[PDB]
Structure formats: C-alpha cells, structure tokens
C-alpha cells in the first residue's frame, strides 16, 4: 500500500494464468495436440479381460 493510499496488486506487476507445470514437451497426434496414458497391467491379471 503506497503513501498515496492506492493498492498495488499482483495483477499490476504480473500476468496470472492457468498454465502448465512443465512446458518442456510438445506432444502431437497427427499434427493435433494430444495427451496419452500407458497402462502397465498387474501381476496375475488377464490381458484380454483387462
């Protein structure tokens, strides 16, 4: 809070945005943005039924 009385906010000194934790990977699927998951199965499980 300045001597004038104005309030300094975070938005006044920075840009706040819902971004990513890690920006160091560009994943594309046929040229489109994508995200994947790998399922690693269990021990004693049926691969077909799973």
């Amino acid at each position: 809070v300045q001597q004038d009385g104005s309030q300094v906010l975070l938005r006044d000194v920075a840009r706040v945005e819902l971004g990513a934790e890690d920006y160091s990977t560009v994943a594309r699927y046929n040229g489109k943005p994508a995200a994947g998951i790998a399922i690693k199965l269990a021990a004693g499980a049926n691969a077909l039924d799973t």
């Binding site: 199965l41 021990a43 004693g44 499980a45 049926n46 691969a47 077909l48």
Partner: protein, 50 residues
C-alpha cells in the same frame, strides 16, 4: 500301469478329471505377451527446477 487295461472306467475318470482341471485352469490363468524377463530395476527421479 498295466492294470488300467482291465479298468476302462478308471482311465475314463482320470481323463475326465484332466479335462475338467484344464478347463478350470484356462478359466483362471494369467495371460500376457511375455513374462518378466528383464531383471528388476528401480528408478529414482528428482527434479531441480532451473
């Protein structure tokens, strides 16, 4: 042994037991492309941003 010749019903019962056991095993037997071939490995990952 040789005495199974005189007891056909015993041989048939043993064959039926084998067939039932094989069916029950097939019903609940894990399937996979390959078993565990690689030696066990443990990965330790740490992150130091910047």
């Amino acid at each position: 042994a040789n005495y199974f010749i005189d007891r056909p019903v015993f041989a048939w019962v043993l064959a039926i037991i084998m067939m039932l056991a094989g069916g029950l095993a097939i019903m609940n037997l894990p399937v996979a492309q390959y078993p565990q071939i690689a030696p066990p490995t443990i990965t330790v990952s740490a992150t130091y941003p910047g």
